[PDB]
Design an enzyme around this catalytic site. Structure first.
Site, PDB file in Angstrom:
ATOM      1  N   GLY A   1       2.822   0.234   4.099  1.00 28.85           N
ATOM      2  CA  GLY A   1       3.071  -1.092   4.018  1.00 28.85           C
ATOM      3  C   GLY A   1       2.662  -2.264   5.469  1.00 28.85           C
ATOM      4  N   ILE A   2       1.487  -0.986   6.184  1.00 32.21           N
ATOM      5  CA  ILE A   2       1.243  -1.864   7.437  1.00 32.21           C
ATOM      6  C   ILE A   2      -0.669  -2.029   7.105  1.00 32.21           C
ATOM      7  CG2 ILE A   2       3.680  -1.469   8.293  1.00 32.21           C
ATOM      8  CD1 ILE A   2       2.203   1.361   9.480  1.00 32.21           C
ATOM      9  N   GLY A   3      -1.160  -0.996   7.005  1.00 33.08           N
ATOM     10  CA  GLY A   3      -2.838  -0.760   7.934  1.00 33.08           C
ATOM     11  C   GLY A   3      -3.439  -1.050   6.626  1.00 33.08           C
ATOM     12  N   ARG A   4      -3.319  -1.269   5.146  1.00 31.67           N
ATOM     13  CA  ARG A   4      -4.829  -2.086   4.327  1.00 31.67           C
ATOM     14  C   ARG A   4      -4.086  -3.040   3.675  1.00 31.67           C
ATOM     15  NH1 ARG A   4      -6.432   3.052  -0.129  1.00 31.67           N
ATOM     16  NH2 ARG A   4      -6.250   3.937   1.735  1.00 31.67           N
TER      17      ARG A   4
ATOM     18  N   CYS B   1       0.945  -1.281  -0.210  1.00 24.87           N
ATOM     19  CA  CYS B   1      -0.155  -0.333   0.324  1.00 24.87           C
ATOM     20  C   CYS B   1       1.089   0.969   0.129  1.00 24.87           C
ATOM     21  CB  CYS B   1      -0.806   0.483   1.287  1.00 24.87           C
ATOM     22  SG  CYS B   1      -0.357  -0.324   3.038  1.00 24.87           S
TER      23      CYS B   1
END
Ligand code: DZS
Length: 483
Positions: free
Chosen positions: A420-423, A417
């Protein structure tokens, strides 16, 4: 420890606590009452209290006047070790955490619960050393432990704001008491050692009863379960030294959002670094950030090296006028070289929620190295929050899964994303849980926060908000209903 987080206080109560029980350099963090989704860092400085806002729309923790972080514990660790970094422009110091006494987010605290149901829960789910703390039964508490096999109940008296088990030391909180008897186990007269090995599991559920648990969490329960998971993030402060190296600094979308050293993708002066981590359940994944102009070539070396044949992009290239992931693939029918790597965009296919790009990847001067890489670009995720319906995400993940399954010896699925951690974490945890249900069938045990915690030990802050947390439950609920 994450005792600096107080889950149930107002800004006035925080200001009062810091003025009466804290000194200069005292701090605590709390959820925002005015903006349910955000957090606040209340700090004592020169006899006065400041309330710094921390925003989390779903990609990271953004500290007003500070930096972007993967978790609140990472933010606190950073600012306690690096002074002068936090600032009218005057430096704010994080010296003394002001500890919370509230037991609400501890894994072992059950609040209102009878001795009968505590015995019911410990007989079923419990094992030797399993325990819980519940309210009595009046104004006092009870510690219930499973040993072997049997269940022992120990009364915890609350006298003048302190807690004790009827003799010896008096504790300022239920947590200090629990930690104390975890290290110094109580011994029954006939020799039974009341060992406090592990808290009782309250989250593991049979997949078929998802509806009943979701209905119970909607009464909110989701916030409490999520906060209990959030408290466990202090155990995941693993080294992130490689990303700190001078030569690696500008390969990070955000300077303080870094891959753990023990799970980072090592690329074979300094040519081995990418902000990406291998994610292994308990099909593998690479959780990575959206490319930077100077990391596009590293991105393709990573895809080639790992034998990845499927890429999941979870953001539009541009959202709210800001670059979320730079275009790292060629135009339809075009051929481009990205360092030693060569990529052809064979064909683009549009679906309602996503675009598919069939890409051919090879190493320059080595024809026989060619392989197809299928890029699934999800384009309908809202600007803020999560989708109101999980159907779109589920149909997409089903297609990604079938593509990945049709390719012999395909490497990990690359998911990316912005940071590179939430979605990214949300898509990966949904994919993991839904994979359990494909194999084992509706007759399987699922544990959403245990799955999340397992992914979080492989990359910092995977799954960022309570809205994403609830979305994962909704997606697992929707998938089971369509079975
Ligand atoms: O050397 C080890 O074995 C070891 C073991 C556990 C760890 O958590 C770490 C470590 N890794 N990163 C960090 N950061 C972040 C940081 C520093 C510099 C620039 C950007 C970022 Cl974002 C800390 O602020 C940190 C603070 C105190 C103590 C360890 C820390 N630490 C290292």
């Amino acid at each position: 420890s994450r005792r600096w987080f107080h889950p149930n206080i107002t800004g006035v109560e925080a200001e009062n606590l810091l003025l009466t029980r804290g000194v200069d350099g005292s701090f605590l963090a709390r959820p925002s009452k005015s903006n349910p989704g955000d957090f606040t860092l209340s700090v004592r400085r020169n006899g006065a209290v400041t309330h710094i806002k921390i925003q989390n729309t779903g990609d990271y923790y953004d500290l007003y006047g500070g930096e972007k972080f993967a978790t609140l514990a990472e933010l606190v660790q950073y600012y306690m070790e690096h002074h002068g970094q936090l600032k009218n422009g005057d430096v704010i110091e994080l010296k003394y955490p002001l500890n919370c006494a509230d037991p609400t987010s501890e894994r072992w605290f059950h609040g209102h619960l009878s001795g009968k149901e505590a015995e019911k829960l410990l007989t079923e789910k419990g094992k030797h050393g399993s325990f819980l703390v519940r309210e009595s039964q009046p104004g006092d508490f009870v510690l219930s432990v499973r040993t072997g096999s049997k269940v022992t109940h120990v009364m915890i008296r609350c006298q003048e704001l302190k807690y004790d088990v009827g003799g010896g030391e008096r504790f300022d909180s239920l947590t200090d008491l629990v930690e104390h008897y975890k290290k110094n186990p109580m011994v029954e007269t006939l020799g039974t050692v009341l060992q406090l090995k592990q808290p009782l599991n309250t989250t593991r559920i049979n997949a078929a009863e998802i509806e009943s648990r979701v209905r119970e969490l909607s009464k909110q329960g989701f916030w409490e379960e999520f906060e209990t998971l959030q408290q466990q993030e202090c155990k995941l402060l693993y080294s992130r030294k490689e990303g700190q190296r001078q030569e690696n600094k500008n390969k990070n979308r955000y300077k303080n959002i870094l891959p753990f050293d023990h799970t980072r993708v090592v690329l074979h002066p300094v040519s081995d670094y990418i902000n990406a981590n291998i994610i292994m359940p308990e099909k593998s994944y690479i959780a990575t950030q959206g490319c930077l102009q100077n990391t596009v070539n590293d991105f393709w070396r990573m895809v080639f090296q790992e034998n990845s044949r499927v890429i999941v992009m979870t953001t539009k290239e541009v959202e709210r006028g800001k670059s979320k992931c730079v275009k790292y693939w060629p135009d339809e029918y075009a051929l481009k070289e990205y360092g030693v790597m060569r990529v052809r965009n064979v064909k683009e296919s549009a679906a309602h929620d996503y675009t598919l790009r069939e890409l051919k990847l090879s190493k320059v001067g080595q024809g026989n190295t060619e392989r197809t890489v299928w890029q699934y670009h999800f384009r309908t995720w809202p600007d803020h929050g999560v989708p109101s319906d999980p159907g779109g995400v589920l149909d997409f993940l089903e297609e990604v899964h079938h593509k990945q399954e049709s390719i012999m010896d395909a490497g990990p699925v690359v998911v990316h994303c912005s940071a590179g951690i939430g979605r990214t974490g949300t898509f990966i945890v949904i994919d993991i849980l839904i994979d359990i249900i494909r194999e084992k069938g509706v007759d399987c045990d699922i544990d959403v926060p245990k799955t999340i915690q397992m992914v979080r030990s492989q990359r910092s802050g995977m799954v960022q908000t309570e809205a994403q947390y609830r979305f994962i439950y909704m997606a697992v609920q929707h998938y089971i209903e369509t079975l």
